[PDB]
């Protein structure tokens, strides 16, 4: 019991491509998604671990 | 130089994150030698260029 749950669910990701279609099919135990993200990229950017307040 | 450093990787990848810690100690190494040597070289020659700059303007005389 994680959270107080025996059952789990998996999270999986993809990056449809502009032009590509994304089709799901299924009988059960699906967690669909809702809201996705168009994204655009550009370096410049990173994951910064910090404790320090910002100003 | 623009900075990036921070790589996660997960439980069954320690080899992985022992080669990005190879990478990022290695490059640090090489750059703090670089530096704290050049530092060390150039006062050297920086003392000898007046003191040769002195005799020059003794012997101008």
């Known amino acids: ?55 | 130089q623009f900075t990036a450093v921070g790589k996660e990787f997960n439980k069954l990848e320690r080899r992985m994150e022992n080669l990005n810690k190879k990478v990022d100690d290695g490059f640090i190494d090489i750059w703090t030698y670089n530096a704290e040597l050049l530092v060390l070289l150039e006062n050297e020659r920086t003392l000898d260029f007046h003191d040769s700059n002195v005799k020059n303007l003794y012997e101008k005389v």
């Not at chain 1, 959270?3 to 502009?18: A, C, M, V």
């Not at chain 1, 799901?24 to 994951?47: D, H, K, T, V, W």
């Open chain 1, 1 to 55: 019991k994680v959270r107080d749950r025996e059952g789990r669910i998996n999270y999986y990701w993809t990056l449809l491509e502009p032009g590509d279609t994304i089709i799901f099919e299924a009988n059960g135990n699906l967690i669909a998604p809702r809201y996705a993200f168009a994204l655009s990229r550009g370096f410049g950017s990173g994951i910064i671990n910090s404790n320090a307040p910002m100003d």
